[PDB]
Design a protein around this ligand. Sequence first.
Ligand SMILES: *[C@@H]1O[C@H](CO)[C@@H](O[C@@H]2O[C@H](CO)[C@@H](O[C@@H]3O[C@H](CO[C@H]4O[C@H](CO[C@H]5O[C@H](CO)[C@@H](O)[C@H](O)[C@@H]5O)[C@@H](O)[C@H](O)[C@@H]4O)[C@@H](O)[C@H](O[C@H]4O[C@H](CO)[C@@H](O)[C@H](O)[C@@H]4O[C@H]4O[C@H](CO)[C@@H](O)[C@H](O)[C@@H]4O[C@H]4O[C@H](CO)[C@@H](O)[C@H](O)[C@@H]4O)[C@@H]3O)[C@H](O)[C@H]2NC(C)=O)[C@H](O)[C@H]1NC(C)=O
Ligand SMILES: *[C@@H]1O[C@H](CO)[C@@H](O[C@@H]2O[C@H](CO)[C@@H](O[C@@H]3O[C@H](CO[C@H]4O[C@H](CO)[C@@H](O)[C@H](O)[C@@H]4O)[C@@H](O)[C@H](O[C@H]4O[C@H](CO)[C@@H](O)[C@H](O)[C@@H]4O)[C@@H]3O)[C@H](O)[C@H]2NC(C)=O)[C@H](O)[C@H]1NC(C)=O
Ligand SMILES: *[C@@H]1O[C@H](CO)[C@@H](O)[C@H](O)[C@H]1NC(C)=O
Lengths: 208, 208, 727, 727
Amino acid sequence: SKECDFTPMLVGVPPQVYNFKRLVFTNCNYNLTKLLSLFMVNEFSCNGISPDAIARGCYSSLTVDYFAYPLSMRSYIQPGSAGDISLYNYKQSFANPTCRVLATAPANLTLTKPSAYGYFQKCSRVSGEHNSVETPLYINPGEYSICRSFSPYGFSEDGEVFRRQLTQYEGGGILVGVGAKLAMTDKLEMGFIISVQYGTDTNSVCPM
Amino acid sequence: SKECDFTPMLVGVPPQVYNFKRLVFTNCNYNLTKLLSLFMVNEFSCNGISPDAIARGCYSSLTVDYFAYPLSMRSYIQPGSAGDISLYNYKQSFANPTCRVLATAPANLTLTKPSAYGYFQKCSRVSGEHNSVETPLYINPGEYSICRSFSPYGFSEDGEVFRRQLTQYEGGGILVGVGAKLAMTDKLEMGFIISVQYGTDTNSVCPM
Amino acid sequence: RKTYTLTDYLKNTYRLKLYSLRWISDHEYLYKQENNILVFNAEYGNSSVFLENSTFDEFGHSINDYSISPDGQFILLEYNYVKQWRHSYTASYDIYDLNKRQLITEERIPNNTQWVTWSPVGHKLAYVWNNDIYVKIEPNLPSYRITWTGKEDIIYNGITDWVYEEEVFSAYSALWWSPNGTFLAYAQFNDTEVPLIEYSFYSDESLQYPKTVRVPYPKAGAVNPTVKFFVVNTDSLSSVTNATSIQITAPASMLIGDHYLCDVTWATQERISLQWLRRIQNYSVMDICDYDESSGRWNCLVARQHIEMSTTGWVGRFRPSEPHFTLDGNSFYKIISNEEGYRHICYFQIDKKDCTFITKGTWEVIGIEALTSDYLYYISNEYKGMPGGRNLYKIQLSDYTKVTCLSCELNPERCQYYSVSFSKEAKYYQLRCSGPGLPLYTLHSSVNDKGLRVLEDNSALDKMLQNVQMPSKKLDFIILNETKFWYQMILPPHFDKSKKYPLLLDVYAGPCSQKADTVFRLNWATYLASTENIIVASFDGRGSGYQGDKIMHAINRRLGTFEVEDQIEAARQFSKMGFVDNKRIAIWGWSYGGYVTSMVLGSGSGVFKCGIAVAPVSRWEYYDSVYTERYMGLPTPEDNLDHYRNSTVMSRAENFKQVEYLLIHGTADDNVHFQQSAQISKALVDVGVDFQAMWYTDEDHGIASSTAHQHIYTHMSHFIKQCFSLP
Amino acid sequence: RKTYTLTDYLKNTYRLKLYSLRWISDHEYLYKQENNILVFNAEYGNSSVFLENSTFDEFGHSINDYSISPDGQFILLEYNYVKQWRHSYTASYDIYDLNKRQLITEERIPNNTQWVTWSPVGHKLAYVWNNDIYVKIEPNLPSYRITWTGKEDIIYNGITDWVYEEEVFSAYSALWWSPNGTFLAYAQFNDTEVPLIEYSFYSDESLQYPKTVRVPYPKAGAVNPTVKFFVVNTDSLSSVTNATSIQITAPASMLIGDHYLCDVTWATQERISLQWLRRIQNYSVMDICDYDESSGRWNCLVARQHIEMSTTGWVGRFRPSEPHFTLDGNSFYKIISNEEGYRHICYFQIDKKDCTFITKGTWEVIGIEALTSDYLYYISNEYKGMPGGRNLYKIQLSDYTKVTCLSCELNPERCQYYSVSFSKEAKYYQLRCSGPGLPLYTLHSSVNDKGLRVLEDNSALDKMLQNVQMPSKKLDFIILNETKFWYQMILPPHFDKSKKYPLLLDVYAGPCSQKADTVFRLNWATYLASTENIIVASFDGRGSGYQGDKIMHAINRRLGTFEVEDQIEAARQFSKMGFVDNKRIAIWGWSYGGYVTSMVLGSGSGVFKCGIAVAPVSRWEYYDSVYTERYMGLPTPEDNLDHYRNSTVMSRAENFKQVEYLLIHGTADDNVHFQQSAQISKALVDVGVDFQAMWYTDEDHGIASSTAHQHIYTHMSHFIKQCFSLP
Ligand SMILES: *[C@@H]1O[C@H](CO)[C@@H](O[C@@H]2O[C@H](CO)[C@@H](O[C@@H]3O[C@H](CO[C@H]4O[C@H](CO[C@H]5O[C@H](CO)[C@@H](O)[C@H](O)[C@@H]5O)[C@@H](O)[C@H](O)[C@@H]4O)[C@@H](O)[C@H](O[C@H]4O[C@H](CO)[C@@H](O)[C@H](O)[C@@H]4O[C@H]4O[C@H](CO)[C@@H](O)[C@H](O)[C@@H]4O[C@H]4O[C@H](CO)[C@@H](O)[C@H](O)[C@@H]4O)[C@@H]3O)[C@H](O)[C@H]2NC(C)=O)[C@H](O)[C@H]1NC(C)=O
Ligand SMILES: *[C@@H]1O[C@H](CO)[C@@H](O[C@@H]2O[C@H](CO)[C@@H](O[C@@H]3O[C@H](CO[C@H]4O[C@H](CO)[C@@H](O)[C@H](O)[C@@H]4O)[C@@H](O)[C@H](O[C@H]4O[C@H](CO)[C@@H](O)[C@H](O)[C@@H]4O)[C@@H]3O)[C@H](O)[C@H]2NC(C)=O)[C@H](O)[C@H]1NC(C)=O
Ligand SMILES: *[C@@H]1O[C@H](CO)[C@@H](O)[C@H](O)[C@H]1NC(C)=O
């Protein structure tokens, strides 16, 4: 049977947190212990499943969000945190059982480190008679910020200010975004959000 | 018996023509065919000995002057030439039988190429009531220019002008020198002047 | 009896006396006297000595200034003063311990320091050096470097660039301490793409090749500098790892384009108010930011933003006014232009849109001076319906209809222009009356507004001035189109209204200017009247402030149109009064007055025989962005370029063939560059207009060197006396 | 009858006529007339038409100039002229074929070309572009690039830097063709370490931020530029590999320190003469170099060097004179200062040290004009013992005692100042008489010195001038310490020596100047005399040339000492003559005259009421090295710094309290920088001296713009009329 292909997470420059990538694994078999052992995990926090058991269960569909995330900012990603990072970059969805993995990648891993860490520290929409009305734009859990289009791959410097007008499909107005740039680290620090589901053909995704 | 050590000619940066180096070989045995075959000779011009026979004779003392010399300026070193190079840099002595060797050095030879070729295009001494008297200083055959002290290893640029006062041992006055800088070439081009002598223990320096 | 000669003015032979004091508590203040600082008891008046200047006979350097810490334990000594611009300068600094009575020599403040300031309470120091901010908790301890990004002429941490210093903040510093000294808020400026003005500086005889000075200076429409705002916690500074500055961004209604930071006002120990202004300066926003103790950052709620925009012109007189918060910081008082067009006090709430005007009328509140829980103290030009005066009122916060004037009728003959200085709880207040009579400084107690004692009454000058023929000041108004336009007249002594005097029009006419007030002045006009029998007159026409927005905003996007005509009409009104010789009417001005003086002389009105313009603006595209754009917009075909073109002095060069003109400018003028006058002289020569010029070597905008200030006013006096056939 | 008004001078209503001609052979010349070039037969006078200007009605650009090739096959057309400095400029160039009557469009000369020149015979071209030299054998063929090292403001191949252009060569080019056009000799200049002068340039109204101009300019004592000399064979130019330039070094008696290249004179087709000058300009050497056909290089023999040094001052009048070689080039004639102190012709041999003076007397040979095998033609100031005149003599080479004046008594009343232009074999010569009468151009034939015909006699002006009251020119001398010091006086019409006129001293006093000559001039002095009844006078004191070295070298290392006193004494001599009102004596000067005018006014002599100085030198350390050091040495404590200090105008600022002073200077002066006048105004203000100033925007040293030239002389006229109470 097909083995769940975890390659895209392990090659090249991993995406920034606000512009993350996801992999729906449907109808394949997985070895998750192998996946996590390639890195060195500093956090493995699971909500709605014991972390032991997620490597063992059979799921209708397993999803994984991956992105580059410094262990420096661990507290801003904990469930129910109040940072710009859960307002404007990434918010964990708890409708399905989920697992949060914060890991450092070794030198002898095939991932390339991006220039620096970045995240949006402001994302709000300007409308009104004289562009007087500011309307902050917070993300729904597990969805993408509209600001990620401004600069998908990172920020040249700290405090980058962006703006553009929103098409009438986007609902008019002027979108404004500000980007914080955090300096990079010694070894690449990465974040993984693993979601699972049960239901139609619960056996579609089973371990090895 | 001791073998005539031709190593100093073959290592490092060879001297400039005006600041050449010489090797008196007394009481050793030599293989000259080996020496010349390390290079690729473009001129082998002997005056007072057939070039064939100089590799075979037995000499009281063999001397060799070596220096870096472009084949571009071959005509200025021919016997009785009128260039600045025989006035101010080097002049072949014919009192003893001698051989002139102009050769290109291969890439796989242990010599390092100096930055460029250089030679003095003016060397004259200034004296008089108001430094009015100029007295050009031409070299006697096989001797060194007094200007070589100004810049022994080469010239940073073309037309370098030098001056200094001459100590009362040197006979007063102000020495003035001008240096021509010729651009260097693809492979190192070198010059050898081999002089021999006969007399006291004519067998001191014999072939192999 | 003698007359007030030019030598009297230029050599300061009739000096005024002041009374300057720092309130160090709510019932004490410091006053220096014979170099020995004295600490007065505000209530009783018994004053012991704080510090005697002979302490520093040992110092070895000439001390420009001193600054005693709020806790009184240390004194900051300033020396090696080197002026940069209007406000900026560099100097070296020594901290002297007052308790140990010793100079501190560990971890000394560096040389060439750009700004120093104590914490508002205690003895912390914040100083700027190489465009970087350093915090010094104890004067004998190492500094904590806050910013690492300072760069000459590029990045300014904690200090202003040229245009923010001059046209926005009117100060060098971009430092704002928290009220109890916990937080240090600061601005960062970035002139990376701002064009440089370049002018020759010749120093002295010795310097063989002149310096070329290069100053980042955005002229009209150019690239403006960009500004960021930060807050740092000065209590949590660690010496092992670098300190964090939390950025505060501007509201998104400002990030959509170029903007300015125009006000920073702390409300509480954990709340700060910022005001931002669009580059088109008819829309401003106040952001109110609370410090989040659980994330360490600052939350500025959108529901707490406050939009102050104008539909007839620019926001504020020169900038949006500052807010005066209550103690709890949940409400604030602020001067706003009301629905009628007059500036009055409004009472906002931090989270509610509307405000309540607590004053109203056909007058303007000049400024909010003090605010207690029971009373709000303000200064306005309401008394006798005179915009030229100033008086101190207090309003009862429990009943806005009960208002009390505290300075109106103290001495209404001599005293009509008042400024005030309150104690730290507003328990006592010092009134300063600048005119029309000799200045008078007095103390009062706020609980009863009781007049305690006279501080300085200038009677020393009063006895001196008896032996000299002083001129008198007529202040009145004329009505044009049923609007009162005010004017003043320095009338020579023994003025005879049946005689026809020559007149000299002293003009500024800048937006929101006021050259017709009640203030007492000894200046060049006093010489011209007392000694040379010349009527000096000033006029406040369209564009002049303090008279309502209908008058002040009348020149919006039309600089050099109405205020130029109105000064010509003022001359006509004066000439038809009768006591003015219309053959001899002149005009003179300095910065906007120089611009207007030249425009008037190029107007071809035939009214003025001669005029003299120092350091004048000639084309508004040559002046800085913040000021010019406030009134003119951008010089683009889409915005206002057509009037930018049709407002130049050079355009009028033909019409100087009728007048006698004198053009004066300093060769090292950082503000109204010598370029401006260079272009006028070019234009006059191309059209074949003869005129007189005078360049002042290495001089700045307001010529301040002693020898040059004497020389200019001497030269100008000869020009006026030649123009009037005066002896 | 009317008077010669200022408008007559400024609008050129009484124009002089010239007769300019290029001798294209030994018996033909070119003359342009109504834009149509005419070729005259020198002997007979019958003149057919060379080229009609309507040929270029098709061209489409305004043509500044034309230059027909020596062979007459091509014409070089100049347009897009852009002046750089006194001599330098850039322009675009088109070559028009005269035979095919077509414009050449293959391989066109680039734009912004700095110098172009034909070969002396034929149609080769040498042009400089981006400081690099290009040779163009055929006008329709590709250029051969000679030099690859040209760099803006750093390396100059074939053209001069600022100071070589202005103070050494008096020309932009550093190109010297071989006599038959085989060799192209050129100089290379290297300003790598020369300091830059920087001044503001404001262009026009549109330019928002001014340009800052930066020009490599060595002031007194600074780093001088360094010079190299090369020769290239233009016949052996190959298009496959780059061309060789053979360097010619200076003699070692020059390489021991800083030096200058001051003369390049080809002797034969294979021999060239170079003259080098020590930076201390009292020692020069001529190097004579023959081309070695067997090595391709150039041999300059030491036995052929020629040392020309001076013991009382600097070598030459402004530079060592040029040699006039014989045909074979083995001997040459050259003007030398003889043992008596007078400049006369010496006859050197290329390989023999001594020379033979062929002229001698108490007069100077001004220049060698032509040299045939039988006669040498020279110009001297010998006639009537007048240094102020010029006359053409020829000397017989077979007998140096036989000398003939060819211009003395042609018309000795009207004509006393002559210049000449010979044909290519000196078979005919055109005399030009510049004064005292109206200019007169005539043709002559050398074999008999026969007067052939009158070319231009200015009788058109003569009839015009009948209806106007012209002033007269008195030229005389006075004796001080038994030395004749000459002077001139523009006397108003109907001059009455029993009346006492105001006087205005027109002063230059520069080393080797001569302001007292016989030349005819219509200028500002003519206005001042004819219309304003003012005697304008000039004087030639110590330092003035053409009167011997005892007079000219009298100011050596002491600029601003004797010539300043001597101009004051001249005023005293004139005032005690009687017809001069000593209440009204003024003084005016421009470059060294401006320096002397200021020095005289700061002298405290009490002699001059008022003075006006345009673009004046104020301190000699501000002026360029080559000129200042020629007369002053170096400003080091070892050489002359003490007098460099004690010769400044700023030192005398106190003594302007007695005089009325007007200071005028251009803001874009590349030569006497505005710095100089800026320092004077500074000094006057610090000492509290009132004066009048006038800056001229974007103007150079000799103010040449039409509007500014009119404006200045109008302003100056008002100053003099005010100073004399004139109507
Ligand atoms: C237009 O005019 C300009 C101004 O007049 C001209 O510009 C000048 O050009 C000359 C050369 O023509 C330069 O001199 C050379 O400078 C070299 C480095 O200079 C750089 O640094 C300058 C700072 O000034 C100080 O700093 C350097 C430190 O590196 C110091 O050495 C130097 O002396 C000076 O005090 C900076 O301002 C410059 O811009 C440069 O970037 C310097 O190394 C040269 O010394 C050389 O050459 C001389 C004579 O040739 C010898 O006596 C020295 O010993 C030394 O020789 C070594 O290096 C040479 C290569 O350059 C080789 O030829 C030699 O073989 C030798 O190498 C061996 O020798 C070593 C011992 O010396 C051994 O230990 C090694 O093992 C090596 O084997 C020389 O001083 C001027 O600096 C330059 N000035 C300016 C302002 O630019 C310009 O040329 C003119 N242009 C035209 C087109 O006309
Ligand atoms: C402008 O002025 C220059 C000189 O400044 C003239 O240039 C010289 O012109 C002469 C012609 O009169 C040239 O001399 C002749 O050269 C012939 C040989 O030419 C080549 O020779 C060798 C090749 O083997 C090359 O190395 C060399 O460079 C030449 O390319 C000779 O045959 C001639 O000599 C004959 O006459 C003499 C007596 O006069 C006899 O003794 C000889 O044996 C022989 O019979 C002759 O010498 C000379 O080479 C040119 N030199 C240079 C540097 O240019 C220009 O001609 C002149 N141009 C104009 C338009 O006026
Ligand atoms: C030098 O190197 C060449 C190859 O590049 C080789 O053929 C030759 O034999 C070598 N000679 C010596 C002396 O190393």
